[PDB]
Amino acid sequence: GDVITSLNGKPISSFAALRAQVGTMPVGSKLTLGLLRDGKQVNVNLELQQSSQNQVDSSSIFNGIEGAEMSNKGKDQGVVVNNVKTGTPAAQIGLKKGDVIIGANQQAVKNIAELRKVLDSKPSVLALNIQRGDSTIYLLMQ
Amino acid sequence: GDVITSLNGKPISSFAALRAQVGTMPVGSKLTLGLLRDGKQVNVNLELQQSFNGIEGAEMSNKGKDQGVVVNNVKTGTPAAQIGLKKGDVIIGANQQAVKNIAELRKVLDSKPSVLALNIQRGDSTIYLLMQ
């Protein structure tokens, strides 16, 4: 029920603008917001954090595969898929929300760094060892 | 992630071949496969599979001693739940005939009526379910 009016002193044009502002700032960036609750001006000190959900798009890792957001899971527990869009290159290979990539091409995957490490090898075909529910499956690429 | 290399000893040409092989074998046929996981040879014994008494995609059994046919568990996509049937129901009778067990139930189905009226009971209520 609060209304944000300013960011680091600079007035806010719109919610969309604010979203874009902070969306570009690095994690841990310390900033201050100007709030308006009950006709009352408020100031607050904030610090950007590591987004648990919808953390990273898939086109950022596969360079061409959109329509699926994913991030790290808990503590080096693989790369879980947060959300999947319909009619997209990602879902075209099977990928669905809730999947957790355990490994790829016989190499264990704990986080996005390890995964990207396998893609740096640039193999002709990619075999993801993901897990849906209590089942273990594979997804092939190329 | 496993790779199948043989079937009953005979090497495998392809996945399509393996599909055709077992696709012609009868249900319950016990066979053995040769697998390859992590560069290690593995052997496994298998038995083909299908895709108390069960009727129309609904699995049931007897209750205590001649206390009707109780429903253990139902499938949603099946025509069973499409007519109302839920888990826990207890068929007291059908078509004005008393049902103590799956034997008396089947004896009514042997009559092959155009319509089947089940006198089940959910909770302390008595309802009916119709078929056809």
Binding site: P89, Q92, I93, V125, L139, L140, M141, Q142 | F15, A16, L18, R19, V22, G23
Partner: peptide, 16 residues
């Protein structure tokens, strides 16, 4: 052709 008388390229996923 024949007449009666993404992912690996060799095939989509078939069921055995």
């Amino acid at each position: 052709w024949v007449s009666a008388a993404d992912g690996s390229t060799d095939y989509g996923i078939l069921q055995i």
